[PDB]
Structure 1
Amino acid sequence: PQITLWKRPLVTIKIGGQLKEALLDTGADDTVLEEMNLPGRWKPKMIGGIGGFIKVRQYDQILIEICGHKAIGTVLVGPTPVNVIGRNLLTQIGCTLNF
């Protein structure tokens, strides 16, 4: 599909057996999701943006379905105000910017 940017580009995603809303975010290197109690091992990470850094948990090889398109890769979990789908998964669903 084609998504205009008059409003936030929120889409439904499926991860860890849950449905959530997340931003298709070309400005995010990585995917960062609201706190959720995923199983398995993880490693600590800090990521920075406007306002400074937050501590997150990095999970690898996570299955995630974005608007019907399947992907698998690294997801960071922590106290983010918003779920963001980053470039690491946007590439996997064939997402481009166009103007």
Structure 2
Amino acid sequence: PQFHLWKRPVVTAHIEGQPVEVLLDTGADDSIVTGIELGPHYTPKIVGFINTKEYKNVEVEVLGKRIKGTIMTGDTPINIFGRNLLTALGMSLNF
């Protein structure tokens, strides 16, 4: 199916079973989310320049698909699913 873009494309995803609302952002290369607790097993990352925790091989369910991917958690004003997850979800921009 398709999503029209009149409204900001915010959907609900479950990351490791924890619900979160995210923005499907074609302007972002990576994904960062907050408000969930993925655990002690992460790689500290630095991306202003905030401090994030990188989790790899995480199960995410959104839009009827269940994938495994990488996600970063940290102080972000918006929860965003960037192109690294959009591609793993088989999403494209149509015109």
Normalised to the residue count of structure 1, the TM-score between the two structures is 0.86
Q: Which amino acid aligns with 2:49?
A: F
Match of 2:27 in 1: 27
Gaps of 5+ in 2: none
SS in structure 1 opposite 2:88?
helix
Which residue does the alignment assign to 2:76? 80
Task: Calculate the aligned-residue CA RMSD, in Å.
Answer: 1.3
Q: How many residues align?
A: 95
1:36 alignment counterpart: 36
Cα distance in 2 for partners of 1:70, 1:8 equals 22
Question: In the alignment, does 2:54 pair up with 1:54?
Answer: no
Q: List 4+ stretches of structure 1 deviating above 4 A.
A: none
TM-score (norm 2): 0.90
Q: Which has the higher strand share?
A: 1
Instruction: Name the SS for the 1:22 alignment partner.
Output: strand
The percent identity for this pair of structures is 48
Q: For 1:94 and 1:36, how far apart are their aligned partners in 2?
A: 24
Gaps of 5+ in 1: none
Q: Bigger CA drift: 58-67 or 36-45?
A: 36-45
